[PDB]
Amino acid sequence: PFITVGQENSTSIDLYYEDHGTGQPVVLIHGFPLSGHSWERQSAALLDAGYRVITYDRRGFGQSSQPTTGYDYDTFAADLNTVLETLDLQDAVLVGFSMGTGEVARYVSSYGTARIAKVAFLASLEPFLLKTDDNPDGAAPQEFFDGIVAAVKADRYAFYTGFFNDFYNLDENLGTRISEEAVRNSWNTAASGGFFAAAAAPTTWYTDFRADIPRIDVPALILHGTGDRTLPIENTARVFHKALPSAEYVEVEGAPHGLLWTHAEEVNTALLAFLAK
Amino acid sequence: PFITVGQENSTSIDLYYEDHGTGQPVVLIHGFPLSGHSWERQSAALLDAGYRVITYDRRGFGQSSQPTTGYDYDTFAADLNTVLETLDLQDAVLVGFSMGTGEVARYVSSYGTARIAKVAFLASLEPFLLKTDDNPDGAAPQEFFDGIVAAVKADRYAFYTGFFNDFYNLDENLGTRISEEAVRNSWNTAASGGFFAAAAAPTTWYTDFRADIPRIDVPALILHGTGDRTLPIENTARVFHKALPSAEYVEVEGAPHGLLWTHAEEVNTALLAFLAK
Amino acid sequence: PFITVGQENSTSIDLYYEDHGTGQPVVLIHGFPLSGHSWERQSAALLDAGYRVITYDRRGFGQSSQPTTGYDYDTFAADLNTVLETLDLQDAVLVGFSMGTGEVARYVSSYGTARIAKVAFLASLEPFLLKTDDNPDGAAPQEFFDGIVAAVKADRYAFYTGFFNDFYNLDENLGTRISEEAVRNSWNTAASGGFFAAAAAPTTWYTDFRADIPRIDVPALILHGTGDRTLPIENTARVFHKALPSAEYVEVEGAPHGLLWTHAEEVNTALLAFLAK
Numbered sequence A, B, C: 001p002f003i004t005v006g007q008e009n010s011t012s013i014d015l016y017y018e019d020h021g022t023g024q025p026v027v028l029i030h031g032f033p034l035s036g037h038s039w040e041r042q043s044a045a046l047l048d049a050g051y052r053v054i055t056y057d058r059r060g061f062g063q064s065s066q067p068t069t070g071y072d073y074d075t076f077a078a079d080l081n082t083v084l085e086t087l088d089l090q091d092a093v094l095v096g097f098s099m100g101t102g103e104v105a106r107y108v109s110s111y112g113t114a115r116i117a118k119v120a121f122l123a124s125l126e127p128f129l130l131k132t133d134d135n136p137d138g139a140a141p142q143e144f145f146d147g148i149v150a151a152v153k154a155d156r157y158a159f160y161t162g163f164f165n166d167f168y169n170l171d172e173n174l175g176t177r178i179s180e181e182a183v184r185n186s187w188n189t190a191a192s193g194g195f196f197a198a199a200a201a202p203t204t205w206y207t208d209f210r211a212d213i214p215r216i217d218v219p220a221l222i223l224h225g226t227g228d229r230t231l232p233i234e235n236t237a238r239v240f241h242k243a244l245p246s247a248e249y250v251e252v253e254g255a256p257h258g259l260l261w262t263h264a265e266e267v268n269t270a271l272l273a274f275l276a277k
Helices: A036-047 A071-088 A098-110 A144-153 A158-170 A181-192 A195-205 A238-242 A264-276 B036-049 B073-087 B099-111 B143-154 B154-169 B180-191 B193-205 B236-241 B264-276 C036-049 C074-086 C100-111 C142-154 C156-168 C180-190 C195-203 C237-244 C264-276
Strands: A002-008 A011-020 A024-029 A054-057 A092-097 A116-122 A222-223 A248-252 B002-008 B011-020 B024-027 B051-055 B092-097 B115-120 B220-224 B247-251 C002-008 C011-020 C025-027 C052-056 C092-097 C116-123 C221-225 C246-250
Touching: A011 A036, A011 A071, A011 B011, A011 C011, A011 C100, A011 C156, A024 A071, A024 A098, A036 A054, A036 A181, A036 A264, A036 B193, A054 A071, A054 B002, A071 A098, A092 A098, A092 B143, A098 A116, A116 A264, A144 A158, A144 A195, A144 B264, A158 A181, A158 A195, A181 B180, A181 B264, A195 B115, A195 C036, A222 A264, A238 A248, A238 B193, A248 A264, A248 B154, B002 B073, B011 B036, B011 B073, B011 C011, B011 C195, B024 B073, B024 B099, B036 B051, B036 B092, B036 B180, B036 B264, B036 C195, B051 B073, B073 B099, B092 C092, B092 C246, B099 B115, B115 B264, B143 B154, B143 B193, B180 C156, B180 C180, B220 B236, B220 B264, B236 B247, B247 B264, B247 C156, B264 C036, C002 C074, C011 C036, C025 C036, C025 C074, C025 C100, C036 C052, C036 C180, C036 C264, C052 C074, C074 C100, C092 C100, C100 C116, C116 C264, C142 C156, C142 C195, C156 C180, C156 C195, C221 C237, C237 C246, C246 C264
Parallel strands: A024 A054, A024 A092, A092 A116, A116 A222, A222 A248, B024 B051, B024 B092, B092 B115, B115 B220, B220 B247, C025 C052, C025 C092, C092 C116, C116 C221, C221 C246
Antiparallel strands: A002 A011, A011 A054, B002 B011, B011 B051, C002 C011, C011 C052
16 A cells, blocks of 8 residues: 655655554554564554554655655654545554654654654654763764764665664574564565665664654653663663653563564553553 | 455555466466465466466465455455456466465355356365364364464464475475575565465465365366375365366375475476366 | 556556656666666765666566566667656666666667767677677577576576576675675565566577667767676677777776676766766
8 A cells, every 4th residue: 555745756755554453543653674564563462452553664665665855854754744644543643663763753743643642662762862962861973873874885785684683682582582584574674675765764863852852742651672782771761761751661671672573572561551541 | 467356444455466478368376375476387388388377466465465354265255256357257267276276166166157167276275174073084173273373473484484394395305396596485475475464364274165166067177296294185185086076186296285386397287288178 | 666668468567667866867777687776886876976867677577567578679678768758858878787788779779869868888788699600709609598598497596596696706706895685685686577587588688789889879888897707798898899989998807797786886987987078
């Protein structure tokens, strides 16, 4: 299925989406460099629990179009907006994972919560990963991001490999929590995203969501893996919770970045309890 | 190419199909967890032999849509019906492989043979794989199927690997009858099917086709690999032939489940002789 | 995005294409058994340089339809024509790599250069790879091509593997100029092209472009890897340059066939200088 969000030269920009089950609508917003398909462990539990599950592939990823434009949180938020309005979702739950948590903050902040019942942030970017003078808690200096960009441009194929190692803590989880086949599928999904999007995505990672946070109006859930090597729990989740005290917060003991797969359980159990309420 | 068979929430359910060559129409119905593309060795021989070759991806597989509904032989048969009627196929040959043989029985049985000239069953499910009191010849107890479902839900990626081993008798055929690259392509195809369809398919495997058989009206071919580790020739092909004495029957000596690839020859030669008549 | 070029039985024949950037239009025509995506190193440099980049997947490859018809340079040239006319490209640069250089010669020759500003031939087929009495410089006897066809039909999966070895000079370049992940992506792309197209493509390789050459009207660039194991520089580039003295010509010292990736640099630098003029 596709939803058209714009135009690029002679072609339109279409997002691949899926719409399963019946019940209260839950929209899942994937992380880099994956696709809506990465939520399969969560989707099955929500379907069983009796929710309507909406997944979509961000522009440049999985089965969506691969323009060379619109790689920024406002565009991504506007893309989300079009999906919501296209489907006329009411009383929806927005769940973002990694990059997806930037969409959740930015949409709520700009568009408001009229269609939105609750939000959930898993392995969040928030509040601001750039380490500055004004942002002391930031996870890295600008030079560091500039780094990743350079690495993806040099050979994103080879890049994906080192990325998944840390994404999943493979030195700990391989053959235990994650099969080699599961990791194979992940690399294939990434290799399938647009070359341009691959190098342009890392630049959206240090977007400042500090002014988005106060706008979160509806009940929220913050969930982070304490073994997160990709988004240090101390520069993210921990400072985010201070910014939104109100958020229900769950720490997944020794879970890596890729906790959707390695700790699907602990993830499903927090998720379903938070949505139950 | 797509043919729309239904609607799921806000999206339609579309089946990916291909239509090649000219001549008498031959429709190929693939097995789990593959796609219309798995018939490539057979398609080339039919094309050379002068037939019109129609392939399609069952819902949840290859390039078709991945709903979370309709995983049962009546739906699958109705999906087939729509294809036949969409293309206005007349005097068609229906060839099913593994799961596909459930479509052939069920369509013939419910819809009749007005568009149908002949049928062929390769590595068949028939007549009833569930081992019961009334079905003594059944290949396994219910607990066994329940088993597979559980295994696919746990990590279908990793599952595909053990599956292909037995599917192809890789301990015997690897590097001989099947290349490692050929097996790689198979895993990629499966990893590409819908997560839901993967776990829901195994439940359609013990459908009782006992009352479908008497309805087969047109000339039939039954072909099985005697080294079939997936569908024991003794619980399937052998009891099916007793149920349809009339069927022309070919045993492929030491061929595994995956005989379309490992024994493409012996397969093409039986197929082309049966269609020639 | 798709552009429909024809009809095959009940289905249309659609070519997958991309249209990025703004500026003078540059159309990239990929080689066997790849797709428009193989130009990613070149596309990024052109985008940065300020060009409009058009890529498309030849029929039977990458994301285009997979008919069992039209595998010949006139059809391929007519396919190109439809793209050009569909987008109303004016003052376009046509860049072909390997197989793509057959499209560039054939289109220019038959349709003329009214929409065309310049052409570039990388790892070219020209002028005639068939070794005959009249074509002494030909790279191989007919028996040799017949060879490849037979090999692809036998197991194209396994075939791709040996192909990429020579395509990339992996014995020299692996772990240096090309990562194992980069090669993995290439095999996956090829495995994804149509089975029919795979075996039918090699027959278009010894098309005689000897009468096409005199028709090249606009400024041209000829670029070849001196370590080309796929298209011997001595039977191709070197005799082509004699046929078109006028062409600007660049030899890439010890570059294999797959120079777009291994020598992206030397490639981008020649390309951008030639387009700059």
